[PDB]
């Protein structure tokens, strides 16, 4: 029942105390049923006091002030921040990981039972609670739903952050988005003791933990997909199309990384060049095997035939990466924004090189 | 979260 | 009881197309035509022979028992026999 | 049109509630019709065929 | 074979319905012969949805019916992990577990109420952290986790009821702040169609899988936290109910309604269970106690007023139950003590494969025997007419 | 192929096998309950169209017409070229599919601007055409003359305003070549007397308003009930025979000029069916009637600048309403209301001048805003008889 | 990979049911013995081709990656989707 209360934003612990009160009222109702078994006078004194004795015996603190005094004592001691988590805006919040996945969030769901207890004891009907429950209510009006949503989004942020943490380069690239989140947090926590901008930092903390989850899945998709395309070589290869797709993937990877929230070329060029290099490397290994399988007195042609076609397709040994795999260069321009062209001459350079290699290989004497 | 975090920490002091 | 033979051969209580033969897949009484039924029962016999060999290849001491394939709600069964084989594509549900 | 065919059915708010329900759809497609009007007017009589 | 290109080229995860179909074909390749009141054979529990956590609510399915999304708002004992549930149960044979499962972006309190879908769900959490997780999901966690920003407040969705045909499939999910998410067929992104609802007092109807009005109206009679159950009316596009409905006398999280019958009138009544077992029958916004149902246990968390017969209705209990009541030859006598799995106060339900039985969303987003075969309409008109007349005669509180 | 189950009489092995197979198929779901299925259980017929700008160069395809006097061979006149330094302007061309060509078959150039043109009654080569100059040119390729072999005297004998509609109304025994211009004049001639007018008179209104004809049409089946469209609508419905000249009656339902109309009959003229539909510039397409001046609803082909309407009288429950950007819309009254039956928007975005339905069949010639011969067809839709559904649809239209 | 759906409809183990292998025979979706899966799928694929002819003559939806050899004590089922044949080593329960 308290689980339904937590599944419905209600008093969990205060509802448990009131639940005890209701079941004890059901015991009193059972005593009234035995009273209904009798008339309406004084002919019901045999075991009625014993009935109330058993009902109050297993429920000695059901509807009494003992639960109210317990909530009041808990509030007076320390139950003021659970229902009053106002520090989830720009305050004490230990966030981070191995890659520094830091943001602004809370964990109000842990002490949510004490939170709901103090909140219901201070706002339902005004139960016995000290001024600390009122402080919890004021800080609740400050950042209550923000702390609850921040706890939920923090849980989802850590869950998506684990998948993003599967690759360390994804954390290095996600740092570029964490810088934007920290920039918004710096803009919201930039004024020297702003007495009127706490709700923006609380709403930004909730949206920041949600952005950590969504950005964790997105940055993991970008970096891990670059690693996946880099390690994906079981579809089609053994031509210039594999390395061409790798180079175009590097260009599109730099553009897609530029479409995100970052400002330094490092993670973008790293994912782009890494995807192109390892994609062309794995596809080049398979292509090397298939390339050896497909493109590996006039009577003195034995001299040329001794080593005629040993290298019919040797125009693809670019130090495994080179970032500009092409056996020639392209044209020029004056001024624009085209900082993602890896190998612009990769459409005819190595093509003419390998074609002349195969032609001179099979025709080393003609 | 490095330069922006350091700026926010310096502003907090 | 040739009529009962055709009924219990390919007119049971729930099947895609069932089968019952006599020797090397040679049935007449079924719920189809003798030519196509002869082809189906012969395919069942070839399935039992090749299934006994490939079953021995799977497990060193196996023969053709029944190809009780799964479906949406059905369960086909190309089963073998002593001197024949019945490709009774039955149905679980 | 097909709705107003049942014009004798304006007794209770089930019908008006359905109008409230498809308000958006109605407004946007009338916007589409007037967008087509804007397109036919901008590409004027000499400009068009 | 010896390779790493498989995961290295297919690092994502999008084979939920395919794996559910593989499990169904797995059962199709196994269950065969060999040549040589509650039935409850076993509850179809989705343990992969929520690890030991009862279903918070459940939204029934139309296309491939009873494939309800039984959201389970799990315990908050997770330091850095998201709870939740979105599942589908396999109660065709009443096995020990469900058909397929999933978690959410946080503890799933009444999933995004979509309708008529066999492989689609969204684990609407207690803090609005909904997560796109198929009904036939293969991941124990959500298939995709949506955002939980400042917009998705702490308003937990509470009243779940499939209200829609197959052409314009929809379902309502009233939230803690009154956000009646009347999501359409494929609406599983966020609470877009979350209609507003707020009263002057007790603006938090703390329900858990509450249902429609007495007549299957589009008004979600959501059980209030302190008695006098509120509602979220979504009849068409111009309805609103600021209900103070009877049946709730404290902590109550659910109000289903005994609708009309072919042998009775509208019968504006619904036996809602109270925390102090003060069950009483009332409509969505009636606030008048027609009739009391059977006993309860601990604080209430649901109610199942049988609409299958106007004379039938049901309260609930702390062991995940539903105490029915029939009025064929009586006035308010009980009918059957149906239940749900686990020994917790389970709060979710669904229908049978052919109906006339409820598959309760129990201890793990299950399908347990909350069967109402003992609550169907009897083959007589005067019986249900006299039962409705007695309920209307005692309609006053 | 042994005992072909010859042992199906009194054996026991195959019998027990069949009984066991029947029991297995009957109990192939031994799980004691229903299996967990996991809630999943586990129209254009384009003919040889023509396009060749030898004369199609900026010359709009004018009046299109299948050979009715001959076996289904369309001929369409032209308009003026915007690239003719000294070339003749009225260059009507023919496009007969019987020749099995790609380019136009016969060229017919005239210095005037030809507007309307048609065939000859039992004369396979006499091309006749009313022009913009008020005269009616006359080509004849039997004498090998691209140029019109005879030009009508442009004065009072012919029209004093641009001739826009010309065709005979009489048979081989009583041919009456009637031409209609913007003067309100009508002029009938014989087969050879281009000097003596057979029946030339006018159709003018009471006041001084210059009666401007707009795609006027001859009476369907020469019932004398001809219609004259005008710029402010103004459907001038009038008769021909007797003393019924001038302006008999009119009716308006819009203010646009009706640039497309088709006087029709039934599926064999079972009824009067003079509920000719229109094509005006307000996009109105109404099933107008002469007697009942303002009949049933207008099926305005919206989202398009409607141009023409024409259909074969053989099963007229197939008719198209095209527009300014080519939207072929043909349908049936008994089944469709404003949606089509079997048609589609025309190729690209042409300005369809004429739609020409096949003589007792289906293939439709398409004339556009240049010399663009597009010859479609539908094929699947056949002139289905027992068209009483169309008749009862008219009956229901006669109710409300 | 198929954690919730597989664990829900198959809360325990002992059998395998319908597990789909990769293209080369790798475990695209599996958690059981892949070596026995590949061996039984290959030999059962050969026997399933013969039984596919039989069952296909009985019910046309037969193929080699869609048959389940069932005996009175065990069953090698190879019947998955477009990935590969399935994997199951259990009798017809």
Short mmCIF file of N, CA and C in Angstrom, two decimals, chain E residues 136-218:
data_model
loop_
_atom_site.label_atom_id
_atom_site.label_comp_id
_atom_site.label_asym_id
_atom_site.label_seq_id
_atom_site.Cartn_x
_atom_site.Cartn_y
_atom_site.Cartn_z
N UNK E 136 6.36 -6.39 -25.73
CA UNK E 136 7.08 -7.64 -25.92
C UNK E 136 8.58 -7.43 -25.86
N UNK E 137 9.05 -6.54 -24.99
CA UNK E 137 10.47 -6.24 -24.88
C UNK E 137 11.28 -7.43 -24.36
N UNK E 138 12.50 -7.54 -24.88
CA UNK E 138 13.42 -8.59 -24.50
C UNK E 138 14.46 -8.12 -23.50
N UNK E 139 14.64 -6.82 -23.37
CA UNK E 139 15.60 -6.29 -22.42
C UNK E 139 14.92 -6.18 -21.07
N UNK E 140 15.62 -6.58 -20.01
CA UNK E 140 15.05 -6.49 -18.67
C UNK E 140 14.91 -5.04 -18.25
N UNK E 141 15.73 -4.18 -18.83
CA UNK E 141 15.74 -2.74 -18.64
C UNK E 141 14.89 -2.19 -19.78
N UNK E 142 14.73 -0.88 -19.88
CA UNK E 142 13.92 -0.33 -20.96
C UNK E 142 14.62 -0.45 -22.31
N UNK E 143 13.81 -0.49 -23.37
CA UNK E 143 14.37 -0.57 -24.71
C UNK E 143 15.03 0.76 -25.07
N UNK E 144 14.49 1.85 -24.55
CA UNK E 144 15.01 3.19 -24.77
C UNK E 144 14.52 4.04 -23.61
N UNK E 145 15.43 4.79 -23.00
CA UNK E 145 15.08 5.64 -21.86
C UNK E 145 14.87 7.07 -22.34
N UNK E 146 13.66 7.59 -22.12
CA UNK E 146 13.35 8.95 -22.53
C UNK E 146 13.82 9.94 -21.47
N UNK E 147 13.64 11.23 -21.68
CA UNK E 147 14.10 12.22 -20.70
C UNK E 147 13.17 12.33 -19.50
N UNK E 148 13.76 12.83 -18.41
CA UNK E 148 13.12 13.06 -17.12
C UNK E 148 13.53 14.43 -16.59
N UNK E 149 13.37 15.45 -17.44
CA UNK E 149 13.76 16.82 -17.12
C UNK E 149 12.83 17.49 -16.12
N UNK E 150 12.96 18.81 -16.00
CA UNK E 150 12.12 19.58 -15.08
C UNK E 150 10.65 19.54 -15.45
N UNK E 151 10.32 19.20 -16.70
CA UNK E 151 8.93 19.11 -17.13
C UNK E 151 8.24 17.90 -16.51
N UNK E 152 8.89 16.74 -16.55
CA UNK E 152 8.35 15.52 -15.96
C UNK E 152 8.50 15.65 -14.45
N UNK E 153 7.48 16.25 -13.82
CA UNK E 153 7.48 16.49 -12.39
C UNK E 153 7.23 15.19 -11.62
N UNK E 154 7.13 15.33 -10.29
CA UNK E 154 6.92 14.20 -9.39
C UNK E 154 5.51 13.62 -9.43
N UNK E 155 4.67 14.10 -10.34
CA UNK E 155 3.31 13.61 -10.47
C UNK E 155 3.33 12.19 -11.00
N UNK E 156 3.13 11.19 -10.15
CA UNK E 156 3.13 9.81 -10.64
C UNK E 156 1.80 9.51 -11.29
N UNK E 157 1.85 8.81 -12.43
CA UNK E 157 0.62 8.44 -13.09
C UNK E 157 -0.07 7.40 -12.22
N UNK E 158 -1.39 7.49 -12.11
CA UNK E 158 -2.07 6.58 -11.20
C UNK E 158 -3.24 5.74 -11.73
N UNK E 159 -4.15 6.35 -12.47
CA UNK E 159 -5.34 5.65 -12.98
C UNK E 159 -5.08 5.16 -14.40
N UNK E 160 -5.10 3.84 -14.59
CA UNK E 160 -4.85 3.22 -15.89
C UNK E 160 -6.09 2.49 -16.37
N UNK E 161 -6.56 2.86 -17.57
CA UNK E 161 -7.74 2.21 -18.14
C UNK E 161 -7.72 2.33 -19.66
N UNK E 162 -7.84 1.19 -20.34
CA UNK E 162 -7.87 1.16 -21.80
C UNK E 162 -9.24 1.66 -22.24
N UNK E 163 -9.30 2.86 -22.82
CA UNK E 163 -10.56 3.45 -23.25
C UNK E 163 -10.41 3.79 -24.73
N UNK E 164 -10.75 2.84 -25.60
CA UNK E 164 -10.64 3.06 -27.02
C UNK E 164 -10.83 1.81 -27.85
N UNK E 165 -11.36 2.00 -29.06
CA UNK E 165 -11.61 0.93 -30.02
C UNK E 165 -10.31 0.57 -30.74
N UNK E 166 -10.42 -0.11 -31.87
CA UNK E 166 -9.21 -0.47 -32.61
C UNK E 166 -8.87 0.54 -33.70
N UNK E 167 -9.81 1.42 -34.07
CA UNK E 167 -9.55 2.42 -35.11
C UNK E 167 -8.90 3.67 -34.52
N UNK E 168 -9.32 4.05 -33.33
CA UNK E 168 -8.81 5.23 -32.64
C UNK E 168 -8.43 4.85 -31.21
N UNK E 169 -7.61 3.80 -31.09
CA UNK E 169 -7.12 3.23 -29.84
C UNK E 169 -6.50 4.26 -28.91
N UNK E 170 -6.94 4.24 -27.65
CA UNK E 170 -6.44 5.16 -26.65
C UNK E 170 -6.69 4.59 -25.26
N UNK E 171 -6.02 5.20 -24.29
CA UNK E 171 -6.16 4.79 -22.90
C UNK E 171 -5.81 5.97 -22.02
N UNK E 172 -6.45 6.03 -20.85
CA UNK E 172 -6.23 7.13 -19.92
C UNK E 172 -5.40 6.69 -18.72
N UNK E 173 -4.53 7.60 -18.28
CA UNK E 173 -3.64 7.39 -17.13
C UNK E 173 -3.60 8.70 -16.34
N UNK E 174 -4.50 8.81 -15.36
CA UNK E 174 -4.55 10.01 -14.53
C UNK E 174 -3.34 10.02 -13.61
N UNK E 175 -2.67 11.17 -13.54
CA UNK E 175 -1.47 11.30 -12.72
C UNK E 175 -1.79 11.84 -11.33
N UNK E 176 -0.75 11.94 -10.50
CA UNK E 176 -0.86 12.44 -9.13
C UNK E 176 -1.28 13.89 -9.09
N UNK E 177 -0.94 14.65 -10.12
CA UNK E 177 -1.34 16.05 -10.19
C UNK E 177 -2.57 16.21 -11.07
N UNK E 178 -3.22 15.11 -11.44
CA UNK E 178 -4.40 15.14 -12.28
C UNK E 178 -4.13 15.04 -13.76
N UNK E 179 -2.88 14.82 -14.17
CA UNK E 179 -2.57 14.73 -15.59
C UNK E 179 -3.10 13.43 -16.17
N UNK E 180 -4.31 13.50 -16.72
CA UNK E 180 -4.95 12.35 -17.33
C UNK E 180 -4.32 12.17 -18.69
N UNK E 181 -3.31 11.32 -18.77
CA UNK E 181 -2.62 11.05 -20.02
C UNK E 181 -3.50 10.12 -20.83
N UNK E 182 -4.30 10.70 -21.72
CA UNK E 182 -5.18 9.94 -22.60
C UNK E 182 -4.41 9.72 -23.90
N UNK E 183 -3.41 8.85 -23.80
CA UNK E 183 -2.53 8.59 -24.93
C UNK E 183 -3.22 7.73 -25.98
N UNK E 184 -2.94 8.05 -27.24
CA UNK E 184 -3.50 7.35 -28.38
C UNK E 184 -2.78 6.01 -28.57
N UNK E 185 -3.07 5.38 -29.71
CA UNK E 185 -2.55 4.08 -30.10
C UNK E 185 -1.03 3.92 -30.00
N UNK E 186 -0.28 4.70 -30.77
CA UNK E 186 1.18 4.61 -30.74
C UNK E 186 1.80 5.70 -29.88
N UNK E 187 1.00 6.38 -29.07
CA UNK E 187 1.50 7.45 -28.21
C UNK E 187 2.26 6.83 -27.04
N UNK E 188 3.59 6.81 -27.14
CA UNK E 188 4.45 6.27 -26.10
C UNK E 188 5.69 7.13 -25.87
N UNK E 189 5.67 8.39 -26.30
CA UNK E 189 6.83 9.26 -26.11
C UNK E 189 6.83 9.89 -24.72
N UNK E 190 5.81 10.71 -24.42
CA UNK E 190 5.70 11.39 -23.13
C UNK E 190 4.26 11.78 -22.86
N UNK E 191 3.97 12.40 -21.71
CA UNK E 191 2.58 12.79 -21.42
C UNK E 191 2.13 13.98 -22.24
N UNK E 192 2.00 13.79 -23.56
CA UNK E 192 1.58 14.88 -24.43
C UNK E 192 0.11 15.19 -24.23
N UNK E 193 -0.73 14.17 -24.29
CA UNK E 193 -2.17 14.35 -24.10
C UNK E 193 -2.55 14.13 -22.64
N UNK E 194 -1.83 14.82 -21.76
CA UNK E 194 -2.06 14.73 -20.33
C UNK E 194 -2.95 15.90 -19.93
N UNK E 195 -4.26 15.66 -19.88
CA UNK E 195 -5.23 16.67 -19.51
C UNK E 195 -5.07 17.08 -18.05
N UNK E 196 -5.26 18.37 -17.79
CA UNK E 196 -5.13 18.92 -16.45
C UNK E 196 -6.37 18.64 -15.61
N UNK E 197 -6.15 18.51 -14.31
CA UNK E 197 -7.22 18.26 -13.35
C UNK E 197 -6.71 18.62 -11.96
N UNK E 198 -7.43 19.51 -11.28
CA UNK E 198 -7.04 19.94 -9.94
C UNK E 198 -8.29 20.44 -9.23
N UNK E 199 -8.45 20.03 -7.97
CA UNK E 199 -9.59 20.43 -7.17
C UNK E 199 -9.15 21.46 -6.13
N UNK E 200 -10.12 22.00 -5.37
CA UNK E 200 -9.79 22.99 -4.35
C UNK E 200 -9.16 22.36 -3.11
N UNK E 201 -9.44 21.09 -2.85
CA UNK E 201 -8.89 20.38 -1.71
C UNK E 201 -8.61 18.95 -2.13
N UNK E 202 -7.50 18.40 -1.63
CA UNK E 202 -7.02 17.05 -1.91
C UNK E 202 -6.82 16.85 -3.42
N UNK E 203 -5.87 17.64 -3.94
CA UNK E 203 -5.52 17.65 -5.36
C UNK E 203 -4.58 16.52 -5.76
N UNK E 204 -4.45 15.47 -4.95
CA UNK E 204 -3.59 14.34 -5.24
C UNK E 204 -4.38 13.05 -5.02
N UNK E 205 -5.07 12.61 -6.07
CA UNK E 205 -5.85 11.37 -6.01
C UNK E 205 -4.84 10.25 -6.17
N UNK E 206 -4.30 9.77 -5.05
CA UNK E 206 -3.26 8.75 -5.02
C UNK E 206 -3.79 7.36 -5.37
N UNK E 207 -4.14 7.18 -6.64
CA UNK E 207 -4.65 5.92 -7.17
C UNK E 207 -3.54 4.98 -7.64
N UNK E 208 -3.92 3.77 -8.04
CA UNK E 208 -3.00 2.77 -8.58
C UNK E 208 -3.90 1.85 -9.41
N UNK E 209 -3.87 2.04 -10.73
CA UNK E 209 -4.68 1.29 -11.71
C UNK E 209 -6.18 1.50 -11.49
N UNK E 210 -6.59 2.75 -11.34
CA UNK E 210 -8.01 3.03 -11.17
C UNK E 210 -8.70 2.89 -12.53
N UNK E 211 -10.02 2.75 -12.51
CA UNK E 211 -10.69 2.53 -13.79
C UNK E 211 -11.76 3.60 -14.02
N UNK E 212 -12.56 3.37 -15.07
CA UNK E 212 -13.65 4.14 -15.64
C UNK E 212 -14.85 4.32 -14.72
N UNK E 213 -15.86 5.07 -15.16
CA UNK E 213 -17.04 5.28 -14.32
C UNK E 213 -18.04 4.15 -14.44
N UNK E 214 -19.14 4.24 -13.69
CA UNK E 214 -20.17 3.21 -13.74
C UNK E 214 -20.93 3.43 -15.04
N UNK E 215 -20.46 2.77 -16.08
CA UNK E 215 -20.98 2.89 -17.41
C UNK E 215 -19.87 2.94 -18.43
N UNK E 216 -18.63 2.73 -17.99
CA UNK E 216 -17.41 2.73 -18.80
C UNK E 216 -17.23 4.07 -19.51
N UNK E 217 -17.48 5.13 -18.75
CA UNK E 217 -17.33 6.48 -19.27
C UNK E 217 -15.84 6.78 -19.28
N UNK E 218 -15.42 7.84 -19.96
CA UNK E 218 -14.00 8.14 -20.00
C UNK E 218 -13.50 8.93 -18.80
#
